[PDB]
Amino acid sequence: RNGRDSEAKRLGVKRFGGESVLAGSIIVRQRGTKFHAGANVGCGRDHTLFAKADGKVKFEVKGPKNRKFISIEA
Amino acid sequence: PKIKTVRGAAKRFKKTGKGGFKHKHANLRHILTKKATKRKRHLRPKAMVSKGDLGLVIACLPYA
Amino acid sequence: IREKIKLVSSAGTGHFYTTTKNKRTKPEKLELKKFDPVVRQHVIYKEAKI
RNA sequence: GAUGGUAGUGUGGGGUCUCCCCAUGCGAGAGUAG
RNA sequence: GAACUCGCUGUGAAGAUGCAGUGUACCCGCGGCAAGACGGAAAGACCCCGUGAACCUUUACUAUAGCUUGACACUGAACAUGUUCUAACGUUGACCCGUAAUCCGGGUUGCGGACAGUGUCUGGUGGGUAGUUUGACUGGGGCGGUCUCCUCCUAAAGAGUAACGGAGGAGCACGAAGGUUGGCUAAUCAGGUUAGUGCAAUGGCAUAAGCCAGCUUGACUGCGAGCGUGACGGCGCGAGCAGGUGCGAAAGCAGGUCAUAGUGAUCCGGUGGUUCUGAAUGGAAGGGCCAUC
RNA sequence: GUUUAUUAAAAACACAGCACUGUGCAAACACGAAAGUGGACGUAUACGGUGUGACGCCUGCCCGGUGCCGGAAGGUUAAUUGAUGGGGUUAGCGCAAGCGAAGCUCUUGAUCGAAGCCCCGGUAAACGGCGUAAGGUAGCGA
RNA sequence: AGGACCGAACCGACUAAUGUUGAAAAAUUAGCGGAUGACUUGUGGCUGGGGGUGAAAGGCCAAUCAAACCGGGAGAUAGCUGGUUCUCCCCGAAAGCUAUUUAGGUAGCGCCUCGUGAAUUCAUCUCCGGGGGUAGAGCACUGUUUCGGCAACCCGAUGCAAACUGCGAAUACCGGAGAAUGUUAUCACGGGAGACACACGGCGGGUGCUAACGUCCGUC
RNA sequence: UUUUGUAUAAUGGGUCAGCGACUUAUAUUCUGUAGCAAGGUUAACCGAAUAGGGGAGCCGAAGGGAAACCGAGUCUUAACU
RNA sequence: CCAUAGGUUAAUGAGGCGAACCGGGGGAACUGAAACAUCUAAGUACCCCGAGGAAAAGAAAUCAACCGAGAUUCCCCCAG
Ligand SMILES: [K+]
Ligand SMILES: [K+]
Ligand SMILES: [K+]
Ligand SMILES: [K+]
Ligand SMILES: [K+]
Ligand SMILES: [K+]
Ligand SMILES: [K+]
Ligand SMILES: [K+]
Ligand SMILES: [K+]
Ligand SMILES: [K+]
Ligand SMILES: [K+]
Ligand SMILES: [K+]
Ligand SMILES: [K+]
Ligand SMILES: [K+]
Ligand SMILES: [K+]
Ligand SMILES: [K+]
Ligand SMILES: [K+]
Ligand SMILES: [K+]
Ligand SMILES: [K+]
Ligand SMILES: [Mg+2]
Ligand SMILES: [Mg+2]
Ligand SMILES: [Mg+2]
Ligand SMILES: [Mg+2]
Ligand SMILES: [Mg+2]
Ligand SMILES: [Mg+2]
Ligand SMILES: [Mg+2]
Ligand SMILES: [Mg+2]
Ligand SMILES: [Mg+2]
Ligand SMILES: [Mg+2]
Ligand SMILES: [Mg+2]
Ligand SMILES: [Mg+2]
Ligand SMILES: [Mg+2]
Ligand SMILES: [Mg+2]
Ligand SMILES: [Mg+2]
Ligand SMILES: [Mg+2]
Ligand SMILES: [Mg+2]
Ligand SMILES: [Mg+2]
Ligand SMILES: [Mg+2]
Ligand SMILES: [Mg+2]
Ligand SMILES: [Mg+2]
Ligand SMILES: [Mg+2]
Ligand SMILES: [Mg+2]
Ligand SMILES: [Mg+2]
Ligand SMILES: [Mg+2]
Ligand SMILES: [Mg+2]
Ligand SMILES: [Mg+2]
Ligand SMILES: [Mg+2]
Ligand SMILES: [Mg+2]
Ligand SMILES: [Mg+2]
Ligand SMILES: [Mg+2]
Ligand SMILES: [Mg+2]
Ligand SMILES: [Mg+2]
Ligand SMILES: [Mg+2]
Ligand SMILES: [Mg+2]
Ligand SMILES: [Mg+2]
Ligand SMILES: [Mg+2]
Ligand SMILES: [Mg+2]
Ligand SMILES: [Mg+2]
Ligand SMILES: [Mg+2]
Ligand SMILES: [Mg+2]
Ligand SMILES: [Mg+2]
Ligand SMILES: [Mg+2]
Ligand SMILES: [Mg+2]
Ligand SMILES: [Mg+2]
Ligand SMILES: [Mg+2]
Ligand SMILES: [Mg+2]
Ligand SMILES: [Mg+2]
Ligand SMILES: [Mg+2]
Ligand SMILES: [Mg+2]
Ligand SMILES: [Mg+2]
Ligand SMILES: [Mg+2]
Ligand SMILES: [Mg+2]
Ligand SMILES: [Mg+2]
Ligand SMILES: [Mg+2]
Ligand SMILES: [Mg+2]
Ligand SMILES: [Mg+2]
Ligand SMILES: [Mg+2]
Ligand SMILES: [Mg+2]
Ligand SMILES: [Mg+2]
Ligand SMILES: [Mg+2]
Ligand SMILES: [Mg+2]
Ligand SMILES: [Mg+2]
Ligand SMILES: [Mg+2]
Ligand SMILES: [Mg+2]
Ligand SMILES: [Mg+2]
Ligand SMILES: [Mg+2]
Ligand SMILES: [Mg+2]
Ligand SMILES: [Mg+2]
């Protein structure tokens, strides 16, 4: 009755804290927002977080909800 | 005897200035309504044959 | 169940869009203002056969 | 929310080897004083 | 293959004269016996595999001889659609001649007669005959199950990761269920999402991603810095730029939908469009390009 | 009687007998691109094919399926025939946009059209079946 | 009279032994059947290979038969098996992924080699910047579970979980900085491959019986 | 030899001598080497000629675009930051 | 019935053989397509007929492109 699975989706963190990015670079692929778009970061339609500026990646526990934000530091 | 061109290949590839090959993209013949405009717009321009495929193409086109 | 249809320009060019439609639930012909890139203006587009 | 101990564990070695132990490094969670 | 060719218990490509340990054994015939030398003989016939072969079967596929249908031809006349007619044609009736000849031909006559028959074309039938096809995975093969896609676990805290491992889904829906602005907040009978999400599971969701209303078509066209993921074909995310549009007071937001399934390369062809091509030339046909089936 | 020369001699094959069916003679049928030839110098008491297998007593029910036979109202339907529409070209007429005869041409495919098939019957010593076409009779039975 | 009877010749071939590098590529010996017939035999003739002939065994057609023999197409094709010959020096795999009428074949990629070119390009270690949800743990959640108090719910105490998480390591991985060391150890492009049957052992697991010198992954 | 693995009780060889398996033609690409160099080279053929003649061709010095066409640009688009 | 078929004799020629090449009449399959049917192998092998020192072909109802060429045959290009 079993014997099915789907293709693994290659989700996860593509650029970790302190790595240099160009604008456009994907930082995390995810289902929903485990991570949230901080400063200089967009959120794509599949909740991909991507750099809007050149700079370094910065993850932070920020908000009243203890939520994890991806931002690009100049 | 002269090597014979693979004539199917010659209808699908053209040699560029620096010796690579441009081809037309797959997936833009039919079943177009369900496809996104963005997808279809990016399939219009001709693309280059990749590194892995060049050996296969060159074999087919000895008079490229 | 959904059937493919042609949204065709009122501008008189031949730019058509394509979409689907549930003809059983929506028997009336669909009409929408959409960008015609020949005349380069938003015009009325009206349903026609695919 | 310490401290201490315990669990786990990288490397090397060992045993009675379904599981452990020793050397060394890292060291929780829970609970406790607070 | 070469031999200076013992037993045993172990070992070991897993059943040893040849390895280890050990026991026994002076050298060499002759007659006997067949327990072993996985003895000799035949590149296992069983079994599986090969996109091997053959022959056989059939309502497997494609053909096809044969049989059969009609049209046209050979093939005509007169009356009316049918009937009559004779002259084509048939005769495996009779007779005559070549001729000594149950062949054959020619002649005369009878009978049949535009029929029959044959050619070309054409529908049917057609294992009579022929060429072939008849998947793969698989704790042997078959039978059963499975084959693409999505979600979770196995998966060893980056990614990825197998089994006929453990559990479920998809092959859509929606011109609103899309866009925006402004409001609004559940299950349950005590509280805070324990509800909701168009449809599985997981991750998300209050700034709600839930729900409602008004106004709308951004379910825009041309592009795209950069990046993710693939052997590749591809697939995905994407600021920003140009044009034009919607909502909003404006900042802004909008290139379909909370996200992750809802899919099919190429060929061949259809449809519309087209500052392209047009085999002497002008056209056209066909081809190209764009959109789409 | 016959048979697997060389591992099978049999319950297998054949057989007289039986039945069905074809065949009117230039027979059906067979060998042959054909001419011919066999059938047969035979003619339905004959000949071919098929099944059964001396003899005795017998051989039930089913025609829905497949085949065969008969039917031809109705439907569908080939070559053939080429209506009718559309396109291409261009003598002309347009100041130009276009329009456009004839001829030629590309295409469309009305009408005509047989058998077959669907359809209506028959047929089981046809292939078969015998709890739906009909439900296994007689006889026999570990 | 008779496909009548008994039985030699003659024609067969039921049984057994022998023989089985035979006396013999089918016989001999002792028995056995038919023996006036659908009998047997001499000579000659005819039928030809998808063809013949067949009282039917796929029998027989020159010791050959589910398509004779000889020559030719012909060196058919063989993803299969076998074999592949002198010497030295340098480097040195893979038995994986993806796809495949694919699975013992093949292609791209990975890994080997040779050449060309170029960044402190790469590695180890130290320090710095990261994201984890595994081990362990726990029980608020999803479930499961025991006991007590009250009796619908909840509470106290106690366990359990690959598809539980109000926690959470070691390691590993990504990035940055620095020294030392290392024949550039790295990356790119180009010539040539082989390989895509792996095995056992350690560790982490699925499966199996925490059975297998079992089977399937990850990693050394 | 074949294999994960063979003293293997897997394969092959009784022995010796002789023979017995990556070739050849043409095309194409890369490397080395030689000539000439923005050029290089001729084919058939002629020629008594390994000479010499023969430059028909071929490759190269330009690309882009499906194509018309444009050209150190060109294509894309109404037009490119 | 004229005749014509037929009959007889004469003269002349043919016949049969031979390696390839050549023109014509027929015409496979293995094989390749990683199966296979279109397609391929290939108008090949093979069979048959006929001829000659050669055969066949041959003086445009040919090309070309508005400029022109000038029968046929063979070689090198064009061009995989
Ligand atoms: K010993
Ligand atoms: K013995
Ligand atoms: K007639
Ligand atoms: K298995
Ligand atoms: K097994
Ligand atoms: K815009
Ligand atoms: K007998
Ligand atoms: K019937
Ligand atoms: K044969
Ligand atoms: K490969
Ligand atoms: K290489
Ligand atoms: K292992
Ligand atoms: K083996
Ligand atoms: K053996
Ligand atoms: K070469
Ligand atoms: K050279
Ligand atoms: K450019
Ligand atoms: K063939
Ligand atoms: K093949
Ligand atoms: Mg998944
Ligand atoms: Mg298209
Ligand atoms: Mg502590
Ligand atoms: Mg603690
Ligand atoms: Mg032993
Ligand atoms: Mg002896
Ligand atoms: Mg003996
Ligand atoms: Mg033996
Ligand atoms: Mg064998
Ligand atoms: Mg007729
Ligand atoms: Mg048939
Ligand atoms: Mg057949
Ligand atoms: Mg074949
Ligand atoms: Mg076959
Ligand atoms: Mg299989
Ligand atoms: Mg992971
Ligand atoms: Mg890990
Ligand atoms: Mg997986
Ligand atoms: Mg792996
Ligand atoms: Mg694997
Ligand atoms: Mg799996
Ligand atoms: Mg770019
Ligand atoms: Mg604008
Ligand atoms: Mg939706
Ligand atoms: Mg959804
Ligand atoms: Mg076609
Ligand atoms: Mg067109
Ligand atoms: Mg023209
Ligand atoms: Mg008898
Ligand atoms: Mg016998
Ligand atoms: Mg016998
Ligand atoms: Mg007769
Ligand atoms: Mg019988
Ligand atoms: Mg009987
Ligand atoms: Mg009829
Ligand atoms: Mg009846
Ligand atoms: Mg008698
Ligand atoms: Mg006999
Ligand atoms: Mg005897
Ligand atoms: Mg007797
Ligand atoms: Mg007797
Ligand atoms: Mg048999
Ligand atoms: Mg014989
Ligand atoms: Mg055969
Ligand atoms: Mg051949
Ligand atoms: Mg051979
Ligand atoms: Mg070495
Ligand atoms: Mg795949
Ligand atoms: Mg645990
Ligand atoms: Mg867990
Ligand atoms: Mg590092
Ligand atoms: Mg393989
Ligand atoms: Mg493998
Ligand atoms: Mg394996
Ligand atoms: Mg393995
Ligand atoms: Mg293990
Ligand atoms: Mg085990
Ligand atoms: Mg094993
Ligand atoms: Mg083995
Ligand atoms: Mg050994
Ligand atoms: Mg031995
Ligand atoms: Mg051996
Ligand atoms: Mg072998
Ligand atoms: Mg041997
Ligand atoms: Mg150019
Ligand atoms: Mg083939
Ligand atoms: Mg002569
Ligand atoms: Mg001549
Ligand atoms: Mg002139």
mmCIF file with all atom_site columns, N, CA, C and O (backbone and C1' of nucleotides) in Angstrom, chain E residues 2-3 5-8 16-20 36-37, chain H residues 9:
data_model
loop_
_atom_site.group_PDB
_atom_site.id
_atom_site.type_symbol
_atom_site.label_atom_id
_atom_site.label_alt_id
_atom_site.label_comp_id
_atom_site.label_asym_id
_atom_site.label_entity_id
_atom_site.label_seq_id
_atom_site.pdbx_PDB_ins_code
_atom_site.Cartn_x
_atom_site.Cartn_y
_atom_site.Cartn_z
_atom_site.occupancy
_atom_site.B_iso_or_equiv
_atom_site.pdbx_formal_charge
_atom_site.auth_seq_id
_atom_site.auth_comp_id
_atom_site.auth_asym_id
_atom_site.auth_atom_id
_atom_site.pdbx_PDB_model_num
ATOM 1  P P     . A E 1 2  ? 50.479 -31.783 -17.924 1.00 0.00 ? 2  A E P     1
ATOM 2  O "O5'" . A E 1 2  ? 51.547 -31.561 -16.767 1.00 0.00 ? 2  A E "O5'" 1
ATOM 3  C "C5'" . A E 1 2  ? 52.747 -30.813 -17.045 1.00 0.00 ? 2  A E "C5'" 1
ATOM 4  C "C4'" . A E 1 2  ? 53.393 -30.485 -15.729 1.00 0.00 ? 2  A E "C4'" 1
ATOM 5  C "C3'" . A E 1 2  ? 53.750 -31.675 -14.844 1.00 0.00 ? 2  A E "C3'" 1
ATOM 6  O "O3'" . A E 1 2  ? 54.987 -32.207 -15.281 1.00 0.00 ? 2  A E "O3'" 1
ATOM 7  C "C1'" . A E 1 2  ? 52.641 -30.049 -13.563 1.00 0.00 ? 2  A E "C1'" 1
ATOM 8  P P     . A E 1 3  ? 55.392 -33.723 -14.961 1.00 0.00 ? 3  A E P     1
ATOM 9  O "O5'" . A E 1 3  ? 55.282 -33.641 -13.376 1.00 0.00 ? 3  A E "O5'" 1
ATOM 10 C "C5'" . A E 1 3  ? 54.600 -34.690 -12.686 1.00 0.00 ? 3  A E "C5'" 1
ATOM 11 C "C4'" . A E 1 3  ? 54.835 -34.530 -11.213 1.00 0.00 ? 3  A E "C4'" 1
ATOM 12 C "C3'" . A E 1 3  ? 54.601 -35.801 -10.395 1.00 0.00 ? 3  A E "C3'" 1
ATOM 13 O "O3'" . A E 1 3  ? 55.815 -36.539 -10.308 1.00 0.00 ? 3  A E "O3'" 1
ATOM 14 C "C1'" . A E 1 3  ? 53.355 -33.999 -9.478  1.00 0.00 ? 3  A E "C1'" 1
ATOM 15 P P     . U E 1 5  ? 54.342 -38.730 -4.486  1.00 0.00 ? 5  U E P     1
ATOM 16 O "O5'" . U E 1 5  ? 53.232 -37.716 -5.027  1.00 0.00 ? 5  U E "O5'" 1
ATOM 17 C "C5'" . U E 1 5  ? 52.551 -36.830 -4.106  1.00 0.00 ? 5  U E "C5'" 1
ATOM 18 C "C4'" . U E 1 5  ? 51.100 -37.227 -4.057  1.00 0.00 ? 5  U E "C4'" 1
ATOM 19 C "C3'" . U E 1 5  ? 50.815 -38.726 -3.859  1.00 0.00 ? 5  U E "C3'" 1
ATOM 20 O "O3'" . U E 1 5  ? 49.718 -38.947 -2.992  1.00 0.00 ? 5  U E "O3'" 1
ATOM 21 C "C1'" . U E 1 5  ? 49.742 -37.977 -5.785  1.00 0.00 ? 5  U E "C1'" 1
ATOM 22 P P     . C E 1 6  ? 49.986 -39.493 -1.508  1.00 0.00 ? 6  C E P     1
ATOM 23 O "O5'" . C E 1 6  ? 48.462 -39.846 -1.210  1.00 0.00 ? 6  C E "O5'" 1
ATOM 24 C "C5'" . C E 1 6  ? 47.763 -39.237 -0.108  1.00 0.00 ? 6  C E "C5'" 1
ATOM 25 C "C4'" . C E 1 6  ? 47.537 -40.298 0.936   1.00 0.00 ? 6  C E "C4'" 1
ATOM 26 C "C3'" . C E 1 6  ? 46.718 -39.847 2.145   1.00 0.00 ? 6  C E "C3'" 1
ATOM 27 O "O3'" . C E 1 6  ? 45.350 -39.933 1.820   1.00 0.00 ? 6  C E "O3'" 1
ATOM 28 C "C1'" . C E 1 6  ? 48.687 -40.839 2.902   1.00 0.00 ? 6  C E "C1'" 1
ATOM 29 P P     . G E 1 7  ? 44.242 -39.011 2.519   1.00 0.00 ? 7  G E P     1
ATOM 30 O "O5'" . G E 1 7  ? 44.168 -39.682 3.958   1.00 0.00 ? 7  G E "O5'" 1
ATOM 31 C "C5'" . G E 1 7  ? 43.600 -40.985 4.150   1.00 0.00 ? 7  G E "C5'" 1
ATOM 32 C "C4'" . G E 1 7  ? 43.525 -41.207 5.640   1.00 0.00 ? 7  G E "C4'" 1
ATOM 33 C "C3'" . G E 1 7  ? 42.801 -40.120 6.441   1.00 0.00 ? 7  G E "C3'" 1
ATOM 34 O "O3'" . G E 1 7  ? 41.394 -40.264 6.372   1.00 0.00 ? 7  G E "O3'" 1
ATOM 35 C "C1'" . G E 1 7  ? 44.826 -40.571 7.482   1.00 0.00 ? 7  G E "C1'" 1
ATOM 36 P P     . C E 1 8  ? 40.418 -38.995 6.284   1.00 0.00 ? 8  C E P     1
ATOM 37 O "O5'" . C E 1 8  ? 40.398 -38.423 7.776   1.00 0.00 ? 8  C E "O5'" 1
ATOM 38 C "C5'" . C E 1 8  ? 40.143 -39.309 8.890   1.00 0.00 ? 8  C E "C5'" 1
ATOM 39 C "C4'" . C E 1 8  ? 40.604 -38.675 10.177  1.00 0.00 ? 8  C E "C4'" 1
ATOM 40 C "C3'" . C E 1 8  ? 40.097 -37.260 10.482  1.00 0.00 ? 8  C E "C3'" 1
ATOM 41 O "O3'" . C E 1 8  ? 38.818 -37.353 11.083  1.00 0.00 ? 8  C E "O3'" 1
ATOM 42 C "C1'" . C E 1 8  ? 42.423 -37.367 10.850  1.00 0.00 ? 8  C E "C1'" 1
ATOM 43 P P     . A E 1 16 ? 37.063 -30.411 2.014   1.00 0.00 ? 16 A E P     1
ATOM 44 O "O5'" . A E 1 16 ? 37.711 -31.661 1.249   1.00 0.00 ? 16 A E "O5'" 1
ATOM 45 C "C5'" . A E 1 16 ? 38.097 -31.559 -0.146  1.00 0.00 ? 16 A E "C5'" 1
ATOM 46 C "C4'" . A E 1 16 ? 39.604 -31.592 -0.271  1.00 0.00 ? 16 A E "C4'" 1
ATOM 47 C "C3'" . A E 1 16 ? 40.360 -32.569 0.651   1.00 0.00 ? 16 A E "C3'" 1
ATOM 48 O "O3'" . A E 1 16 ? 41.508 -33.140 0.033   1.00 0.00 ? 16 A E "O3'" 1
ATOM 49 C "C1'" . A E 1 16 ? 41.225 -30.435 0.911   1.00 0.00 ? 16 A E "C1'" 1
ATOM 50 P P     . U E 1 17 ? 41.478 -34.548 -0.740  1.00 0.00 ? 17 U E P     1
ATOM 51 O "O5'" . U E 1 17 ? 43.020 -34.946 -0.709  1.00 0.00 ? 17 U E "O5'" 1
ATOM 52 C "C5'" . U E 1 17 ? 43.578 -35.606 0.450   1.00 0.00 ? 17 U E "C5'" 1
ATOM 53 C "C4'" . U E 1 17 ? 45.080 -35.597 0.332   1.00 0.00 ? 17 U E "C4'" 1
ATOM 54 C "C3'" . U E 1 17 ? 45.733 -34.229 0.126   1.00 0.00 ? 17 U E "C3'" 1
ATOM 55 O "O3'" . U E 1 17 ? 45.956 -33.674 1.412   1.00 0.00 ? 17 U E "O3'" 1
ATOM 56 C "C1'" . U E 1 17 ? 46.604 -35.770 -1.446  1.00 0.00 ? 17 U E "C1'" 1
ATOM 57 P P     . G E 1 18 ? 45.460 -32.200 1.789   1.00 0.00 ? 18 G E P     1
ATOM 58 O "O5'" . G E 1 18 ? 46.591 -31.312 1.101   1.00 0.00 ? 18 G E "O5'" 1
ATOM 59 C "C5'" . G E 1 18 ? 47.969 -31.523 1.478   1.00 0.00 ? 18 G E "C5'" 1
ATOM 60 C "C4'" . G E 1 18 ? 48.846 -30.850 0.460   1.00 0.00 ? 18 G E "C4'" 1
ATOM 61 C "C3'" . G E 1 18 ? 48.640 -29.335 0.288   1.00 0.00 ? 18 G E "C3'" 1
ATOM 62 O "O3'" . G E 1 18 ? 49.874 -28.636 0.276   1.00 0.00 ? 18 G E "O3'" 1
ATOM 63 C "C1'" . G E 1 18 ? 48.605 -30.416 -1.778  1.00 0.00 ? 18 G E "C1'" 1
ATOM 64 P P     . C E 1 19 ? 50.611 -28.226 1.644   1.00 0.00 ? 19 C E P     1
ATOM 65 O "O5'" . C E 1 19 ? 49.615 -27.127 2.231   1.00 0.00 ? 19 C E "O5'" 1
ATOM 66 C "C5'" . C E 1 19 ? 49.796 -25.730 1.897   1.00 0.00 ? 19 C E "C5'" 1
ATOM 67 C "C4'" . C E 1 19 ? 49.020 -24.886 2.871   1.00 0.00 ? 19 C E "C4'" 1
ATOM 68 C "C3'" . C E 1 19 ? 49.143 -25.292 4.337   1.00 0.00 ? 19 C E "C3'" 1
ATOM 69 O "O3'" . C E 1 19 ? 50.352 -24.730 4.799   1.00 0.00 ? 19 C E "O3'" 1
ATOM 70 C "C1'" . C E 1 19 ? 46.875 -24.991 3.805   1.00 0.00 ? 19 C E "C1'" 1
ATOM 71 P P     . A E 1 20 ? 51.232 -25.496 5.894   1.00 0.00 ? 20 A E P     1
ATOM 72 O "O5'" . A E 1 20 ? 50.261 -25.333 7.144   1.00 0.00 ? 20 A E "O5'" 1
ATOM 73 C "C5'" . A E 1 20 ? 50.139 -24.071 7.822   1.00 0.00 ? 20 A E "C5'" 1
ATOM 74 C "C4'" . A E 1 20 ? 49.353 -24.289 9.091   1.00 0.00 ? 20 A E "C4'" 1
ATOM 75 C "C3'" . A E 1 20 ? 49.797 -25.455 9.974   1.00 0.00 ? 20 A E "C3'" 1
ATOM 76 O "O3'" . A E 1 20 ? 50.898 -25.055 10.772  1.00 0.00 ? 20 A E "O3'" 1
ATOM 77 C "C1'" . A E 1 20 ? 47.476 -25.549 9.709   1.00 0.00 ? 20 A E "C1'" 1
ATOM 78 P P     . G E 1 36 ? 32.096 -41.889 -4.035  1.00 0.00 ? 36 G E P     1
ATOM 79 O "O5'" . G E 1 36 ? 33.401 -40.989 -3.918  1.00 0.00 ? 36 G E "O5'" 1
ATOM 80 C "C5'" . G E 1 36 ? 33.465 -39.982 -2.905  1.00 0.00 ? 36 G E "C5'" 1
ATOM 81 C "C4'" . G E 1 36 ? 34.869 -39.446 -2.855  1.00 0.00 ? 36 G E "C4'" 1
ATOM 82 C "C3'" . G E 1 36 ? 35.472 -38.935 -4.165  1.00 0.00 ? 36 G E "C3'" 1
ATOM 83 O "O3'" . G E 1 36 ? 34.961 -37.662 -4.521  1.00 0.00 ? 36 G E "O3'" 1
ATOM 84 C "C1'" . G E 1 36 ? 37.035 -40.286 -3.089  1.00 0.00 ? 36 G E "C1'" 1
ATOM 85 P P     . A E 1 37 ? 34.858 -37.210 -6.058  1.00 0.00 ? 37 A E P     1
ATOM 86 O "O5'" . A E 1 37 ? 36.383 -36.946 -6.459  1.00 0.00 ? 37 A E "O5'" 1
ATOM 87 C "C5'" . A E 1 37 ? 37.143 -35.944 -5.747  1.00 0.00 ? 37 A E "C5'" 1
ATOM 88 C "C4'" . A E 1 37 ? 38.608 -36.085 -6.086  1.00 0.00 ? 37 A E "C4'" 1
ATOM 89 C "C3'" . A E 1 37 ? 39.021 -35.721 -7.515  1.00 0.00 ? 37 A E "C3'" 1
ATOM 90 O "O3'" . A E 1 37 ? 39.184 -34.315 -7.662  1.00 0.00 ? 37 A E "O3'" 1
ATOM 91 C "C1'" . A E 1 37 ? 40.032 -37.768 -6.899  1.00 0.00 ? 37 A E "C1'" 1
ATOM 92 P P     . A H 2 9  ? 40.435 -26.774 -8.534  1.00 0.00 ? 9  A H P     1
ATOM 93 O "O5'" . A H 2 9  ? 39.040 -27.421 -8.953  1.00 0.00 ? 9  A H "O5'" 1
ATOM 94 C "C5'" . A H 2 9  ? 38.575 -28.614 -8.293  1.00 0.00 ? 9  A H "C5'" 1
ATOM 95 C "C4'" . A H 2 9  ? 37.162 -28.385 -7.820  1.00 0.00 ? 9  A H "C4'" 1
ATOM 96 C "C3'" . A H 2 9  ? 36.971 -27.310 -6.747  1.00 0.00 ? 9  A H "C3'" 1
ATOM 97 O "O3'" . A H 2 9  ? 35.618 -26.899 -6.605  1.00 0.00 ? 9  A H "O3'" 1
ATOM 98 C "C1'" . A H 2 9  ? 36.691 -29.432 -5.792  1.00 0.00 ? 9  A H "C1'" 1
#
